[PDB]
Amino acid sequence: FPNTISIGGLFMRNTVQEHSAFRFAVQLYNTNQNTTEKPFHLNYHVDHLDSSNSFSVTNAFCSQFSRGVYAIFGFYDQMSMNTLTSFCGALHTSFVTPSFPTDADVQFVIQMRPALKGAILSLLSYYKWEKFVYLYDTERGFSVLQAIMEAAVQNNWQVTARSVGNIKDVQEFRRIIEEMDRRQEKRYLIDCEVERINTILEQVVILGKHSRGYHYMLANLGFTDILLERVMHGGANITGFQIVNNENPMVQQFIQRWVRLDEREFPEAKNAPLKYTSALTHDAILVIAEAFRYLRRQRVDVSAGDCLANPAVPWSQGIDIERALKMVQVQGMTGNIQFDTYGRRTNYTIDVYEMKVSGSRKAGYWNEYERFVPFSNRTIVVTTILESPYVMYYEGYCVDLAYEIAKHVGIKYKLSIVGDGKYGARDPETKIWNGMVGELVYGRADIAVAPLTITLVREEVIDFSKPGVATPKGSALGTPVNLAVLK
Amino acid sequence: FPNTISIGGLFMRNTVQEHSAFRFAVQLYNTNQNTTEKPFHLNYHVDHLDSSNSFSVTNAFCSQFSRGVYAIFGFYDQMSMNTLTSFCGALHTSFVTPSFPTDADVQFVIQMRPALKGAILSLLSYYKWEKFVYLYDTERGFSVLQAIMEAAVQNNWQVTARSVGNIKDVQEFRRIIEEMDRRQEKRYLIDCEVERINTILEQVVILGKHSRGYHYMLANLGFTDILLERVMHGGANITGFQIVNNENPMVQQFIQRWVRLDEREFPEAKNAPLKYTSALTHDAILVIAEAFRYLRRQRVDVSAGDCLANPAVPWSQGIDIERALKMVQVQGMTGNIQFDTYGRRTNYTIDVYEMKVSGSRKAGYWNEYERFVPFS
């Protein structure tokens, strides 16, 4: 068995705290005095790669491979995931990563990040969500999206799915929020990156939808990195998922020893909140150390060419190292760590937090076997037209009719005069309705108590009561308004 | 100058007819008896990619690079474009591709699928499309989506965009169509693949939303590969784009010599409709031949290691080959062929077809300088 074991490290951009955690964990493993805990020295060959250039990624991976490594700890993005995964699976080199788990079943990859699909489904079942929105981007895989769609089909849910990964203008976010609010959707499920979640939440705050009655389920293990002070001040319900529990004594020790690090040699240390990815990196170091100690104990011989060989010769010892890595049983900052045959984590203990007015609170926890266990009248827009004797400065015949109708039906109504001041007609060129007909067809109003003449063209886009009151087609107010008009 | 020019071929899955067209065009160039037309013998080395294992793609590209190739004709998709483009740019190896043009500006890649942004925008402005649906997928890049959104912001349109790339259940298509119909959306822009376009058209036919009052603009070259008879009987307006003019004498001669080929030697050539990708492959052979003939004429010397050498030193003659490939002005099956500094088509004409009940009719043509010119 070698006296010193070297591993490769692959870090992307915007990844500085994780690098510090990696180096600090290696230093901690080396510094251990007990020979049993540290039977061999550990070395790293950290390198930085740009996922936007596959050539550079291949060169970095091949430098790591040629220099001689036993395992590679690295990050991959949706762009560079394929290259690293395929090369690692082809050359028989285990790849420990804390990034998003791969959708497909691939060997020689150990993913430190637990999957959120089961927890999300369990929370949706617990909260009894039968109809909601799902704003998603495909930067962490399609597993969650496919699971949500399959569950909705099976359970006959009403999920409004929207891909927000390609949106670069916040006005589109505002339009989406307004359109979905007009449909009376109180429940959102945001499965996006931290910055995208922040943008969506801030657009919500400006739109003023953070009041009571709104529930936001942030499907991201970045609850600490999400800015929601405004939203908690609003009073809306927020549900989040986390894996690093501050009450764990190991986490407390790691944090207390992590703060005293100088910001020069360990940048970002003791400056910003500890990202969960850093905990995953520390746990990855622990997993590698335990696996290699197990390999040494069992007296397994371990001991490099080029990536591009037509007769690709895999390591005879690669399978042994992969098996040793995947059979590990350790306790780390993220709890129990166990991997199945495909390198995915098992025995999750995801902490489910329910944000309260005072602050964040632990709602409960989710495990693979115990499932989830807890720790415990809108104003209706009435579009009208300014025309005597129907509407005057409001008072008039139509105002009285609207008051009577809103009395016969149980509703609260707010009048609004159409900005363009037109009754309505289809433009022959652009096929765009205007006036109150346009307001009703496009959902900007719920009812039009105005002298709208009943016509064949209009009857095909909206529903008229008896001699008439107009409503958008398919609305729930059609029959009540008709009956009120009768009486 | 070498007496024999060798090129590489990288053909992904479902690329049989393009392979046959590649071989046939190379044979046609070689069989020419004119001394000036064929000053060298053209050889090709064909490999088939998997496109789903980056290791396989890199292995194939490195085999091609090592065996010795002056140019590489190939295909790529969104899941293998980055690898081939990066390797070709780094090693100064020209990559002639009929695939979708890259969103970003990259070097050492000659793309000859004309961009549809200008034609689509011109048609939208000409038809007064100030409110329409936009069903798109990202299998050919985000260029069209970005152009449409910028145009909507600038012109105050009311585009309703929907990414149908990740939809695998037709019920989602039906729900989307029903929702847009409840909002009185009569005009659609479907920038999707041929299979997804066919699925969407099947859904609209099932829902009956193909009457005389609906207009569908299929923003995808390959108008002949889309099943439109069912929607044709409905009477809805359908607009499509093409780059191969069937009445072109060169296309006529190629078809005449192309339908009388052995089905064993040239599979898919007979009893199948020519794809625009095959025409682009033939035009790519024309471009390569013209570029190397020009290089020979100017007495430019052109004449290889491994992919991953640190530092990777590009070979000095790659600049000259790329420059000679990008300065060609040749008339092929897809009309005029010229390239700008970034290896994209210029001075290209896109035929706009409005399909009627009687049959498809060439409504007009679009050019960069002269915009949409209807025939009336």
PDB file of all heavy atoms in Angstrom, chain B residues 2 4 38 44 69 79 117 140 150 165 167 200 212 224 286 303 310 319 366, unseen atoms left out:
ATOM      1  N   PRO B   2      -0.161  18.922 -52.324  1.00  0.00           N
ATOM      2  CA  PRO B   2      -0.342  17.467 -52.376  1.00  0.00           C
ATOM      3  C   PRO B   2      -1.098  17.037 -53.622  1.00  0.00           C
ATOM      4  O   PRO B   2      -1.917  17.778 -54.172  1.00  0.00           O
ATOM      5  CB  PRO B   2      -1.147  17.155 -51.107  1.00  0.00           C
ATOM      6  CG  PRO B   2      -1.026  18.359 -50.247  1.00  0.00           C
ATOM      7  CD  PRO B   2      -0.868  19.513 -51.175  1.00  0.00           C
ATOM      8  N   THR B   4      -3.086  14.513 -53.390  1.00  0.00           N
ATOM      9  CA  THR B   4      -4.271  13.874 -52.835  1.00  0.00           C
ATOM     10  C   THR B   4      -4.667  14.615 -51.569  1.00  0.00           C
ATOM     11  O   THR B   4      -3.836  14.806 -50.676  1.00  0.00           O
ATOM     12  CB  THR B   4      -4.011  12.394 -52.530  1.00  0.00           C
ATOM     13  OG1 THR B   4      -3.893  11.662 -53.756  1.00  0.00           O
ATOM     14  CG2 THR B   4      -5.142  11.806 -51.698  1.00  0.00           C
ATOM     15  N   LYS B  38     -10.372  18.994 -61.596  1.00  0.00           N
ATOM     16  CA  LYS B  38      -9.920  17.987 -60.637  1.00  0.00           C
ATOM     17  C   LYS B  38      -8.398  17.937 -60.652  1.00  0.00           C
ATOM     18  O   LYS B  38      -7.801  16.994 -61.189  1.00  0.00           O
ATOM     19  CB  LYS B  38     -10.514  16.615 -60.956  1.00  0.00           C
ATOM     20  CG  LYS B  38     -10.192  15.548 -59.920  1.00  0.00           C
ATOM     21  CD  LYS B  38     -10.718  14.182 -60.332  1.00  0.00           C
ATOM     22  CE  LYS B  38      -9.870  13.552 -61.427  1.00  0.00           C
ATOM     23  NZ  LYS B  38      -8.523  13.154 -60.933  1.00  0.00           N
ATOM     24  N   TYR B  44     -11.822  10.547 -48.352  1.00  0.00           N
ATOM     25  CA  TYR B  44     -12.547  10.853 -47.129  1.00  0.00           C
ATOM     26  C   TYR B  44     -12.453   9.673 -46.175  1.00  0.00           C
ATOM     27  O   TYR B  44     -12.372   8.516 -46.597  1.00  0.00           O
ATOM     28  CB  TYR B  44     -14.015  11.180 -47.414  1.00  0.00           C
ATOM     29  CG  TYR B  44     -14.741  10.097 -48.174  1.00  0.00           C
ATOM     30  CD1 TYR B  44     -15.426   9.095 -47.504  1.00  0.00           C
ATOM     31  CD2 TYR B  44     -14.743  10.078 -49.559  1.00  0.00           C
ATOM     32  CE1 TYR B  44     -16.092   8.105 -48.192  1.00  0.00           C
ATOM     33  CE2 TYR B  44     -15.406   9.091 -50.257  1.00  0.00           C
ATOM     34  CZ  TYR B  44     -16.079   8.106 -49.569  1.00  0.00           C
ATOM     35  OH  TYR B  44     -16.741   7.121 -50.262  1.00  0.00           O
ATOM     36  N   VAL B  69      -5.969  14.891 -41.759  1.00  0.00           N
ATOM     37  CA  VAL B  69      -7.089  15.448 -42.504  1.00  0.00           C
ATOM     38  C   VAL B  69      -6.917  16.956 -42.613  1.00  0.00           C
ATOM     39  O   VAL B  69      -6.567  17.633 -41.641  1.00  0.00           O
ATOM     40  CB  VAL B  69      -8.442  15.101 -41.844  1.00  0.00           C
ATOM     41  CG1 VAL B  69      -8.668  13.598 -41.867  1.00  0.00           C
ATOM     42  CG2 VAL B  69      -8.496  15.634 -40.418  1.00  0.00           C
ATOM     43  N   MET B  79     -25.829  18.510 -27.681  1.00  0.00           N
ATOM     44  CA  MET B  79     -25.124  17.692 -26.705  1.00  0.00           C
ATOM     45  C   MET B  79     -23.757  17.219 -27.187  1.00  0.00           C
ATOM     46  O   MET B  79     -23.056  16.535 -26.435  1.00  0.00           O
ATOM     47  CB  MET B  79     -26.036  16.523 -26.308  1.00  0.00           C
ATOM     48  CG  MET B  79     -25.509  15.558 -25.257  1.00  0.00           C
ATOM     49  SD  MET B  79     -26.759  14.293 -24.906  1.00  0.00           S
ATOM     50  CE  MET B  79     -26.733  13.312 -26.393  1.00  0.00           C
ATOM     51  N   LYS B 117     -33.509  33.864 -38.496  1.00  0.00           N
ATOM     52  CA  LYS B 117     -33.947  35.024 -37.724  1.00  0.00           C
ATOM     53  C   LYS B 117     -34.502  36.109 -38.638  1.00  0.00           C
ATOM     54  O   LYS B 117     -35.616  36.606 -38.431  1.00  0.00           O
ATOM     55  CB  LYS B 117     -32.791  35.582 -36.891  1.00  0.00           C
ATOM     56  CG  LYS B 117     -31.913  34.535 -36.216  1.00  0.00           C
ATOM     57  CD  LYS B 117     -30.812  35.164 -35.362  1.00  0.00           C
ATOM     58  CE  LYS B 117     -29.969  36.181 -36.124  1.00  0.00           C
ATOM     59  NZ  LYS B 117     -29.312  35.588 -37.320  1.00  0.00           N
ATOM     60  N   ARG B 140     -31.781  23.692 -31.383  1.00  0.00           N
ATOM     61  CA  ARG B 140     -30.991  24.350 -32.416  1.00  0.00           C
ATOM     62  C   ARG B 140     -30.394  25.670 -31.940  1.00  0.00           C
ATOM     63  O   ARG B 140     -29.934  26.462 -32.771  1.00  0.00           O
ATOM     64  CB  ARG B 140     -31.838  24.597 -33.670  1.00  0.00           C
ATOM     65  CG  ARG B 140     -32.312  23.323 -34.363  1.00  0.00           C
ATOM     66  CD  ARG B 140     -33.585  23.536 -35.178  1.00  0.00           C
ATOM     67  NE  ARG B 140     -34.607  24.277 -34.447  1.00  0.00           N
ATOM     68  CZ  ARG B 140     -35.366  23.764 -33.489  1.00  0.00           C
ATOM     69  NH1 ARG B 140     -35.245  22.502 -33.112  1.00  0.00           N
ATOM     70  NH2 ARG B 140     -36.268  24.537 -32.892  1.00  0.00           N
ATOM     71  N   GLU B 150     -36.260  40.026 -28.318  1.00  0.00           N
ATOM     72  CA  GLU B 150     -35.800  41.394 -28.525  1.00  0.00           C
ATOM     73  C   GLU B 150     -36.758  42.157 -29.431  1.00  0.00           C
ATOM     74  O   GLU B 150     -37.083  43.321 -29.165  1.00  0.00           O
ATOM     75  CB  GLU B 150     -34.390  41.387 -29.114  1.00  0.00           C
ATOM     76  CG  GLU B 150     -33.316  40.938 -28.134  1.00  0.00           C
ATOM     77  CD  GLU B 150     -31.955  40.790 -28.786  1.00  0.00           C
ATOM     78  OE1 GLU B 150     -31.854  41.006 -30.012  1.00  0.00           O
ATOM     79  OE2 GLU B 150     -30.986  40.455 -28.072  1.00  0.00           O
ATOM     80  N   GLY B 165     -39.729  21.785 -25.342  1.00  0.00           N
ATOM     81  CA  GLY B 165     -38.657  20.819 -25.511  1.00  0.00           C
ATOM     82  C   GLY B 165     -38.728  19.683 -24.508  1.00  0.00           C
ATOM     83  O   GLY B 165     -38.416  18.535 -24.835  1.00  0.00           O
ATOM     84  N   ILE B 167     -41.469  18.584 -22.943  1.00  0.00           N
ATOM     85  CA  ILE B 167     -42.778  17.945 -22.873  1.00  0.00           C
ATOM     86  C   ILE B 167     -42.703  16.585 -23.553  1.00  0.00           C
ATOM     87  O   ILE B 167     -42.240  16.471 -24.694  1.00  0.00           O
ATOM     88  CB  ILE B 167     -43.854  18.833 -23.519  1.00  0.00           C
ATOM     89  CG1 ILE B 167     -44.145  20.037 -22.616  1.00  0.00           C
ATOM     90  CG2 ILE B 167     -45.121  18.019 -23.791  1.00  0.00           C
ATOM     91  CD1 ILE B 167     -45.217  20.972 -23.140  1.00  0.00           C
ATOM     92  N   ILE B 200     -47.235  18.388 -32.689  1.00  0.00           N
ATOM     93  CA  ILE B 200     -48.072  19.554 -32.416  1.00  0.00           C
ATOM     94  C   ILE B 200     -49.182  19.669 -33.454  1.00  0.00           C
ATOM     95  O   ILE B 200     -50.331  19.987 -33.124  1.00  0.00           O
ATOM     96  CB  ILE B 200     -47.207  20.828 -32.364  1.00  0.00           C
ATOM     97  CG1 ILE B 200     -46.250  20.763 -31.170  1.00  0.00           C
ATOM     98  CG2 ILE B 200     -48.090  22.067 -32.279  1.00  0.00           C
ATOM     99  CD1 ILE B 200     -45.225  21.877 -31.135  1.00  0.00           C
ATOM    100  N   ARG B 212     -60.152  27.862 -41.050  1.00  0.00           N
ATOM    101  CA  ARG B 212     -59.645  28.897 -41.944  1.00  0.00           C
ATOM    102  C   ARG B 212     -59.090  30.101 -41.194  1.00  0.00           C
ATOM    103  O   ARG B 212     -58.343  30.889 -41.784  1.00  0.00           O
ATOM    104  CB  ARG B 212     -60.752  29.352 -42.896  1.00  0.00           C
ATOM    105  N   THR B 224     -40.586  20.082 -46.532  1.00  0.00           N
ATOM    106  CA  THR B 224     -41.052  18.883 -47.215  1.00  0.00           C
ATOM    107  C   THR B 224     -41.085  17.656 -46.314  1.00  0.00           C
ATOM    108  O   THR B 224     -41.688  16.647 -46.695  1.00  0.00           O
ATOM    109  CB  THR B 224     -40.163  18.593 -48.427  1.00  0.00           C
ATOM    110  OG1 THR B 224     -38.816  18.367 -47.991  1.00  0.00           O
ATOM    111  CG2 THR B 224     -40.187  19.763 -49.398  1.00  0.00           C
ATOM    112  N   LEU B 286     -18.758  20.956 -52.653  1.00  0.00           N
ATOM    113  CA  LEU B 286     -18.417  22.003 -53.613  1.00  0.00           C
ATOM    114  C   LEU B 286     -17.513  23.056 -52.982  1.00  0.00           C
ATOM    115  O   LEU B 286     -16.518  23.477 -53.585  1.00  0.00           O
ATOM    116  CB  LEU B 286     -19.689  22.658 -54.153  1.00  0.00           C
ATOM    117  CG  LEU B 286     -20.657  21.789 -54.958  1.00  0.00           C
ATOM    118  CD1 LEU B 286     -21.780  22.646 -55.518  1.00  0.00           C
ATOM    119  CD2 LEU B 286     -19.939  21.056 -56.079  1.00  0.00           C
ATOM    120  N   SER B 303       0.069  21.261 -45.910  1.00  0.00           N
ATOM    121  CA  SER B 303       0.524  19.897 -45.668  1.00  0.00           C
ATOM    122  C   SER B 303       0.682  19.639 -44.174  1.00  0.00           C
ATOM    123  O   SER B 303       1.495  18.813 -43.759  1.00  0.00           O
ATOM    124  CB  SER B 303       1.849  19.635 -46.389  1.00  0.00           C
ATOM    125  OG  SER B 303       2.222  18.272 -46.289  1.00  0.00           O
ATOM    126  N   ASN B 310       0.101  19.694 -24.335  1.00  0.00           N
ATOM    127  CA  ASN B 310       0.156  20.894 -23.519  1.00  0.00           C
ATOM    128  C   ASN B 310       1.542  21.513 -23.590  1.00  0.00           C
ATOM    129  O   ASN B 310       2.504  20.905 -23.101  1.00  0.00           O
ATOM    130  CB  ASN B 310      -0.195  20.571 -22.062  1.00  0.00           C
ATOM    131  CG  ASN B 310      -1.636  20.130 -21.894  1.00  0.00           C
ATOM    132  OD1 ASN B 310      -1.910  19.011 -21.460  1.00  0.00           O
ATOM    133  ND2 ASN B 310      -2.568  21.011 -22.240  1.00  0.00           N
ATOM    134  N   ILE B 319      -4.773  28.556 -40.640  1.00  0.00           N
ATOM    135  CA  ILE B 319      -5.297  29.888 -40.929  1.00  0.00           C
ATOM    136  C   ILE B 319      -5.583  30.027 -42.418  1.00  0.00           C
ATOM    137  O   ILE B 319      -6.639  30.526 -42.823  1.00  0.00           O
ATOM    138  CB  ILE B 319      -4.309  30.969 -40.452  1.00  0.00           C
ATOM    139  CG1 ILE B 319      -4.035  30.866 -38.946  1.00  0.00           C
ATOM    140  CG2 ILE B 319      -4.840  32.358 -40.794  1.00  0.00           C
ATOM    141  CD1 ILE B 319      -5.250  31.051 -38.055  1.00  0.00           C
ATOM    142  N   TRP B 366     -36.837  35.772 -49.425  1.00  0.00           N
ATOM    143  CA  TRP B 366     -36.244  36.707 -48.482  1.00  0.00           C
ATOM    144  C   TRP B 366     -34.743  36.783 -48.715  1.00  0.00           C
ATOM    145  O   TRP B 366     -34.074  35.755 -48.881  1.00  0.00           O
ATOM    146  CB  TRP B 366     -36.518  36.290 -47.032  1.00  0.00           C
ATOM    147  CG  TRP B 366     -35.948  37.242 -46.022  1.00  0.00           C
ATOM    148  CD1 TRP B 366     -36.590  38.288 -45.428  1.00  0.00           C
ATOM    149  CD2 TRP B 366     -34.616  37.236 -45.491  1.00  0.00           C
ATOM    150  NE1 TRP B 366     -35.744  38.933 -44.559  1.00  0.00           N
ATOM    151  CE2 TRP B 366     -34.526  38.307 -44.580  1.00  0.00           C
ATOM    152  CE3 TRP B 366     -33.492  36.430 -45.697  1.00  0.00           C
ATOM    153  CZ2 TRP B 366     -33.358  38.592 -43.876  1.00  0.00           C
ATOM    154  CZ3 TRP B 366     -32.334  36.715 -44.996  1.00  0.00           C
ATOM    155  CH2 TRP B 366     -32.276  37.786 -44.098  1.00  0.00           C
TER     156      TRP B 366
END
